[PDB]
Symmetry: C2
Subunit: 387 residues, 2 copies
């Protein structure tokens, strides 16, 4: 039977990432090419992860996709571009047989919806990576992930990751690369403060309105970001927390400034976001040092960076300024509670905001996508349908 000339199911996981130098605005809407480079921190899959199973079989009648147990239209443009690009690269042996088969894709994630995380970024990084497994595609997959969602390319790598905007109109150099591994800065901690607040402007549609109407955005991309990429890279390389934190806050605030300069304006921060920002600055002022950073994506949730040794105290300050309407306040990494000094208490807001923060997801820097090797991990049954 070895003398004759010539199904597969693979399940992978992928991380979410948080941009510290923000992507906002495309120079090419079709190829998903950005007006500036971006830089993010990959969060640990121990706490947050997308899982995707890809099966191919000679028996599958059609291409079919599910997200969190619900079937979605296989024909979505971003999804079609992703699949087209992985097939292109694979061609760029069982391979032809493999390609002849319809695909069945099923994915899930463990992100609370209120968490407002980039499910799309992790989702397309996982899709690209799992398709690459199925089709035996070696080398960088940025071009595949990016077509699904721009920032998805940054979830292809662990640690600290840059998406290089690229110079080429075909997008071949618009790719992600690791700046430093997830073991580079083990003391770094990330706290996602999920706020009680809500339909936000879609970031795809929104950022294109900004490209069209914000003059500050153009100045930002042309004259600010390239040099910021370099400073932020150096802070990360040097484990310079104060430099990292200051640049992180500034680039977040600048991004939201360009949203406000958009016509009509886009506003993601709310009054709770603004109270979190004030808490962060007050906490730092009390310590006389930059101990904590915030950054905000396309919504009001605050993403906090701090060092392991500051986590307990800062969580106590959050509880003080936003007395929680839950006893389960801290999800993910646990730290023993600590009491705030009288001096810090009086430096914080006199009138707190009970329930402003729904809960905190506590996590750390983590690895890139991973292949799962357990039979039971597959989100599709033998039939190639969800279980």
């Amino acid at each position: 039977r070895e003398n004759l000339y010539f199904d597969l199911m693979v399940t992978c996981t992928a991380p979410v990432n948080i941009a510290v130098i923000k992507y906002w605005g495309k120079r090419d809407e079709a190829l998903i090419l950005p007006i500036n480079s971006s830089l993010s921190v990959t969060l640990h899959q121990d706490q947050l992860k997308t899982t995707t199973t890809v099966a191919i079989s000679k028996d599958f009648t059609e291409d079919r996709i599910w997200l969190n147990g619900r079937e979605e239209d296989v024909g979505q443009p971003r999804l079609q571009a992703c699949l087209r690009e992985i097939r292109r690269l694979a061609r760029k042996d069982t391979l032809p047989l493999s390609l002849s088969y319809k695909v069945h894709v099923a994915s899930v994630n463990n992100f609370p919806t209120a968490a407002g995380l980039a499910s799309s970024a992790a989702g397309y990084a996982c899709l690209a990576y799992t398709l690459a497994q199925v089709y035996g595609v070696e080398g960088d997959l940025s071009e595949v992930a990016r077509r699904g969602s721009g920032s998805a390319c940054r979830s292809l790598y662990g640690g600290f990751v840059e998406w290089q905007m690229g110079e080429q109109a075909d997008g071949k150099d618009s790719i992600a690369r690791q700046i430093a591994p997830e073991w580079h800065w083990p003391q770094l901690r990330i706290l996602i403060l999920v706020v009680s607040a809500d339909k936000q402007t879609g970031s795809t549609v929104g950022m294109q309105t900004s490209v069209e109407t914000s003059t500050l955005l153009k100045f930002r991309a042309e004259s600010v970001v390239p040099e910021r990429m370099k400073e932020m890279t150096r802070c990360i390389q040097e484990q310079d927390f104060q430099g990292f934190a200051q640049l992180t806050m500034k680039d977040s605030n600048q991004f939201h400034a360009t949203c406000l300069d958009t016509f009509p304006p886009i506003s993601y921060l709310n009054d709770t976001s603004r109270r979190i920002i004030q808490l962060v600055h007050r906490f730092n002022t009390h310590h006389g040092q930059t101990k904590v950073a915030y950054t905000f994506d396309a919504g009001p949730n605050a993403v906090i960076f701090t060092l392991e040794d500051t986590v307990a105290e800062f969580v106590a300050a959050v509880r003080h300024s936003f007395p929680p309407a839950a006893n389960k306040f801290l999800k993910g990494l646990q730290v023993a509670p600590v009491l705030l000094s009288d001096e810090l208490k009086a430096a914080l807001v006199v009138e707190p905001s009970p329930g402003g923060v729904q809960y905190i997801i506590a996590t750390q820097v983590g690895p890139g996508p991973q292949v799962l090797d357990d039979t039971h991990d597959h989100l599709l049954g033998q039939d190639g349908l969800p279980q």
Copy 2:
């Protein structure tokens, strides 16, 4: 022994002043352009009395005595007294000054009124921009009626950093202004200290002042000259958002708009979309209150929309100019949002004249003794 009482208007910048190039002389990083609001609805009243009997300068605001040694107050008094001698006993007289206003802008009308009233008492003729500006930068814009530019000036001595009227108050008689006073909120950074932080830390601010505002001044001027409401409206909203963007880009950031401001912004865009044209514009100063510009024929409808989206708390919602109420169409209601008591009340007004000397029909804010009555 002379007592004079004048009033001065508030003004709303449509091309925003934000950031000084010279903190001492109060010279701005860009020119600004404002609409003078009518003193029949909003005004500062100031009485100045001059006498041999007064041993020291004394000043009251809204019934409360204030420290005359305030740097801005001293700068204003110094400049007027310098000019008083130039035009010419009384150059050595001390003054008692009392002012009141009907406000929820304030320092602009306050210093425009002080400069104007001191000029009356001291007999000072000609442009008072520099006197008012030294008290508060935007105060020079309240010296003229209608549509007024504060020209940033090219001279280091600041003598050409002055206000000039672009068009008089009768130029665009259909224009109306609604101030939406939002429910009380905690006060964010003061604007003098705040804008200086922006000069020190915002890169977007430098680009704005150098590369955006000079062109917008010209575009705005043209829209005003042509009574082009849609052009005027779009620029007004854009420049307000840009101003607040540079605040967000400051380190640490300054955020004057709140969730209510945000909801008013969304009401304006939805209202305009429903109508298929720009009917209404917003602009915000250094706080969450919305200033709305619209034409006379749209006021009633828009007031009804505000009422709908922000149901008033139970206890007169429309102050100032009165317009008969209308009901919103089902189509518009459906297109809008709501927030109960978000808006405390609305002040409606129109474009108005510069400062005015009051006749003796009105009582002075000081009695015969030169003290508040």
